Amino acid sequence: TYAVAFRLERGLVFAADTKKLQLWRQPGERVFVLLSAGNLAATQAVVSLINEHLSQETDDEVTTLFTAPNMYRAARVVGDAVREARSINTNFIFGGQIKGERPRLFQIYPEGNFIEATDDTPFFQIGEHKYGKPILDRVARSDMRLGEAAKLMLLSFDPIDLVIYERDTFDVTREKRISADDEYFRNLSNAWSDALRQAFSKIEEFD
Amino acid sequence: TYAVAFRLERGLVFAADTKKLQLWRQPGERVFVLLSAGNLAATQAVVSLINEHLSQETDDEVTTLFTAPNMYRAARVVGDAVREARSINTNFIFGGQIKGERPRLFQIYPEGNFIEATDDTPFFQIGEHKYGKPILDRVARSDMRLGEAAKLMLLSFDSPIDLVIYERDTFDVTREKRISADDEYFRNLSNAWSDALRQAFSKIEE
């Protein structure tokens, strides 16, 4: 499998093929999205540990997703789960927003350490292969619209769960599953062939 | 690691990143190119078996690269070496031309069986990741110019790179060079591709 996420000024966009996209939410206060591109047992193990602490934790000092005061602290909670799940290979992407702070996006490595998305590096890719990485490197900007980034991300896939998180909304109203049978996806793909052909036609003319 | 080849009306183009590109030739008569996407030992074992039959073969009925009457028969020689090398799990690409026949291109699997390039899909890719497959699927044409195809192969890859261009009916390979990352021509082409992609994406935002 493959998954990809973008951090933009207007918010966050998450995409993963076929659940590979996991959602936590306290209405008005916080939203979290975890993307996975490992095996099904590995995703469930990490999700179960996160949920165990939310549902059964007795110790007040242990930080959970719902007591984390900021997104860095929340990323450390997910980092702990990813590390501990190995006891029960691939990276995870974790992003979201807590009230009082900007939306933030992280890539979690197997040992629980992570890196954060920046202005210069506004997206993360996970899976066996980082599909369409050159197209993202060349075209992506942190000030693109959420719908524009969603389109660019879908063209890098070559059944897809797509989630657009709008900054300061604390919900996932703009969520959608996109099949091969979908109408707009085929028409977008057709337009992308013609545009790439025209683009390369100008490259061959340019020389 | 990566290699790619194109079968065009005007000839053949071969590319591999960093030899993983191997040449054989008889002036005016035949030319062959092997591309590898495995370790040094696997590539070396296959090449050494091909050359062993060319240099030391006592049995005249055994087909070699220089006795093969056509490129299908030449591909079977390479297939035998690829299979026998595993005695001493990566694909190879094999292409060339023998006098009296069109240029032909093949992808060899680990057991020595192969498939030939058709004009529907005029290219092969081998390695861990088939880098740029979607760009090649969308843009590649069998009627492209040789330089045009080479540019598409490098731009779709978007990684030095060893490149070989064979012109149809010449039966020699001269256009062979190692393209570094700092090369000024590849820089200018890369910058033009970014802008062309940005223009292309701007048209689909609409």
Residue B44, phi then psi, degrees to nearest 5: -65, -40
Residue boundaries of the structural domains of chain B = 1-206
Q: Give ∠ CA B3-B7-B9 in degrees, rounded to 5.
A: 155
The answer to whether the Cβ–Cβ distance between B134 and A132 falls below 8 Å is yes
- The residue assigned the tokens 């202005």 is A119
> Which amino acid belongs to residue A193?
S
Q: Is B15 exposed, middle or buried (0-12, 13-18, 19+ CB in 10 A)?
A: buried
> Which amino acid belongs to residue A171?
D
C-alpha distance from B153 to closest chain A C-alpha (Å): 12
* Closest chain B residue to A151, measured at CA: B205
Q: Could you say which DSSP state residue B169 is in?
A: T
B30: part of which helix (H) or strand (E)?
strand B30-36
- A158 shares contact with chain B (CB less than 8 Å): yes
Q: Name the residue facing A138 among B145, B152, B197 (closest C-beta).
A: B197
User: Nearest to residue B27, comparing CAs of B174, B175, B163?
Assistant: B174
Query: In Å, what resolution does this model reach?
Result: 2.0
Distance CA B135, CA B153 (A): 9
Contacting residues of B for A6, CB less than 8 Å apart: none
- A197 shares contact with chain B (CB less than 8 Å): yes
Distance CA A121, CA A108 (A): 15
- A150 shares contact with chain B (CB less than 8 Å): no
Q: Which residues of A48-59 are buried (b: 16+ CB within 10 A; e: fewer)?
A: ebbeebeeeeee
- The residue assigned the tokens 């209405």 is A27
* Closest chain B residue to A191, measured at CA: B204
Contacting residues of A for B134, CB less than 8 Å apart: 132, 158
Distance CA A82, CA A43 (A): 9
- A204 shares contact with chain B (CB less than 8 Å): yes
CB pairs under 8 A between A and B: 64
Strand A11-17 versus strand A21-26 pairing type? unpaired
- A134 shares contact with chain B (CB less than 8 Å): yes
B93: part of which helix (H) or strand (E)?
strand B92-98
Distance CA B156, CA B116 (A): 22
Q: Where are the beta strands (DSSP E) in chain A?
A: 2-7, 11-17, 21-26, 30-36, 92-98, 104-108, 114-116, 123-127, 160-166, 174-178
Contacting residues of A for B128, CB less than 8 Å apart: 129
**SS (HEC) of chain B:** CCEEEEECCCEEEEEEECCCEEEEEECCCEEEEEEECCCHHHHHHHHHHHHHHHHHCCCCCCCCCCCCCCHHHHHHHHHHHHHHHCCCCCCEEEEEEECCCCCEEEEECCCCCEEECCCCCCEEEECCCCCCHHHHHHHCCCCCCHHHHHHHHHHHHCCCEEEEEEECCCCCCCCEEEECCCCHHHHHHHHHHHHHHHHHHHHHHC
- A47 shares contact with chain B (CB less than 8 Å): no
Q: Is A143 helix (H, G, I), strand (E, B) or coil?
A: coil
Q: Could you say which DSSP state residue A128 is in?
A: S
B178: part of which helix (H) or strand (E)?
strand B176-179
The answer to whether the Cβ–Cβ distance between A196 and B199 falls below 8 Å is no
Technique behind the model: X-ray
User: Nearest to residue B161, comparing CAs of B33, B23, B20, B16?
Assistant: B16
